[PDB]
Amino acid sequence: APISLPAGTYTLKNVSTGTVLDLWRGEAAEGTAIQGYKSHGGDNQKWRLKWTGKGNQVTLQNVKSGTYVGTASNIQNSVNVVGSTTAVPLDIVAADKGFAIEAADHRLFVLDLKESNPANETPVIYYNNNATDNQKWKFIDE
Amino acid sequence: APISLPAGTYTLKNVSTGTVLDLWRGEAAEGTAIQGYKSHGGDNQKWRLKWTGKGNQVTLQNVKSGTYVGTASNIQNSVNVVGSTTAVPLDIVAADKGFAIEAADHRLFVLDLKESNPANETPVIYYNNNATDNQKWKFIDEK
């Protein structure tokens, strides 16, 4: 079958833990934490994938908040991934399990579920791509 | 339920032309042209996608020849994509239609069906990623 990753709304499930990409209660405030959390079907755990028109770059927009995957500071190892009105452009890169989500302009760095911790509220960070399983995300379309 | 692109055998259909990635005569000789061609189901038009173990990098191996997607010369604009005993490692990047096939160690460059020409034997080349449709490929998984 043809395999496509269409623009649309997704649950993004961390390969290492089975917890999902989660924006804290869906708050639209700048810097609102993005984290790993048990799937509960809330709109704060749904993300809109959309291509920007530049290269293959995309943004991810939280369904509850309307804010985007952004950054607490200058994208570096251990920098928090956070909700922002300013989107960080991303590349979705096929991995051996799921997809890596790369910083388009800082391609060394990917979304990383800190220390592969399945605990609720475990922080998601930018980190050097080692293609460990906490740096891979299953894309579940809805 | 989750959308995934598994390791397996694929037909790779150019988004612009509808023609597919084709190894010339399915020949195993080093430097054999890779090109666009009308789909006919031959093994020379089937490609094995496999992760190398380094990062998210993959290779594409021709089913007929056993050789890999590689290069004629130092990767630059318009350099031929060819069958080689030396794979060029790739990154498969989600595009607005299909996927871009990026050179992993020369990431400004993608596999490009030259000038979006749907003619048989149209060269596939390395070329700056402009995200034009001739630089996007439908990954058709063989079951």
Q: Which residues of A touch B140 (CB under 8 A)?
A: 1-3
Residue of B2, B58, B99 with shortest CB distance to A139:
B2
Asked whether B108 and B129 are in contact (CB, 8 A), the reply is: yes
* Cβ B31 vs Cβ B73: under 8 Å: no
Q: What is the distance, to the nearest Å, from the Cα of residue B98 to the centroid of all Cα atoms in its chain?
A: 12
Contact A18, A118 (CB under 8 A): yes
Give the angle A40-A45-A48 at the CA atoms, nearest 5°. Answer: 145
A1-142 — its CATH code?
Answer: 2.80.10.50
* Contact (Cβ atoms closer than 8 angstroms) between residue A110 and residue A63: no
C-alpha–C-alpha distance, residues B67 and A51, integer Å:
34
Q: What does the DSSP assignment read for A75-105?
A: S-TTEEEEEESSPPPEEEEE-SSSEEEEETT
Give Cα A35 to chain centroid, integer Å.
Answer: 9
Whether B118 contacts B17, CB under 8 Å: yes
Instruction: Tell how many helices (H) and how many strands (E) occur in chain B.
Output: 0, 13
CB proximity list for B31: less than 8 A, separation 6 or greater = B72, B82, B83, B84
For an interface test with A, which of B56, B58, B105 has the most A Cβ atoms less than 10 Å from its Cβ? B56
Concatenate the DSSP letters of all residues of B68-132 into one string.
Answer: EEEESSSS-TTPBEEEESSPPPEEEEE-SSSEEEEETTEEEEEEEEGGG--STTEEEEEEE----
To the nearest whole angstrom, how far is the Cα of A4 from the nearest Cα of chain B? 6
Contact B5 A94 (CB under 8 A): yes
Cross-chain CB nearest to A3 (options B95, B100, B139): B139
Burial zone of B106 (CB within 10 Å; 0-12 exposed, 13-18 middle, 19+ buried): middle
Nearest Cα of chain B lies from the Cα of A130 at a distance, in angstroms, of 6
Ordered by start, the domain boundaries in chain B are 1-143
Both structure tokens of B67: 């050789």
Burial class of A36 by CB neighbour count within 10 A (0 to 12, 13 to 18, 19+): buried
Task: Let me know: does B91 contact A131? Beta carbons within 8 Å.
Answer: no
Q: What is the largest CA-CA distance in chain A?
A: 41
* Residues of chain B contacting A95 with CB distance shorter than 8 Å: 51, 56
Closest CA to A36 of A13, A53, A56: A13
Measured between beta carbons, the chain A residues lying within 8 angstroms of B131 are 54-56
Q: Are strands B32-37 and A90-94 parallel, antiparallel or unpaired?
A: unpaired
**Two structure tokens written together for A84:** 């922002």
The residue of B10, B47, B60, B96 whose CB has the most chain A CBs within 10 angstroms, and thus the best one to mutate to test that interface, is B96
**B87-105 residues labelled b (16+ CB within 10 A) or e (exposed):** bbbbbbbbbbebbbbbbbe
**CB of B39 closer than 8 Å to CB of B140:** no
Q: φ, ψ for residue B44 (rounded to 5)?
A: -75, -5
Give the CA distances from residue B115 to residues B49, B83, B134, in Å, rounded to whole numbers and listed in that order.
25, 21, 7
Pairwise CA distance, residues B103 & B97, whole Å: 19
Question: Which residues of chain B have a Cβ shorter than 8 Å from any chain A Cβ?
Answer: 1-5, 7, 13, 51, 54-56, 58, 91-100, 107, 129-131, 138-141, 143
Both structure tokens of A117:
């911790």
Tell me the chain B residues in contact with residue A7 when contact means C-beta distances shorter than 8 Å: 96
Q: Which two tokens stand for residue B132?
A: 């034009």
The resolution, in angstroms to one decimal, equals 1.6
- Experimental method of this PDB entry: X-ray
Coil, strand or helix: which one is A115?
A: helix
Beta bridge partners of B21: B36
From residue B93, give the alpha-carbon distance in Å to each of A118, B9, B73.
Answer: 27, 18, 24
**What is the spatial distance between Cα A125 and Cα B55, in angstroms, rounded to a whole number?**
18
Which residues in chain A have Cβ-Cβ distances shorter than 8 Å to B99? 94
Gap between the terminal Cα atoms of chain A = 19
Distance CA B130, CA B102 (A): 12
Class of B1-143 in CATH: mainly beta
Whether residue B31 contacts residue B83, with contact meaning beta carbons closer than 8 Å, is answered with yes
CB burial of residue A24 (10 Å; 0-12, 13-18, 19+): middle
The length of chain A is: 142
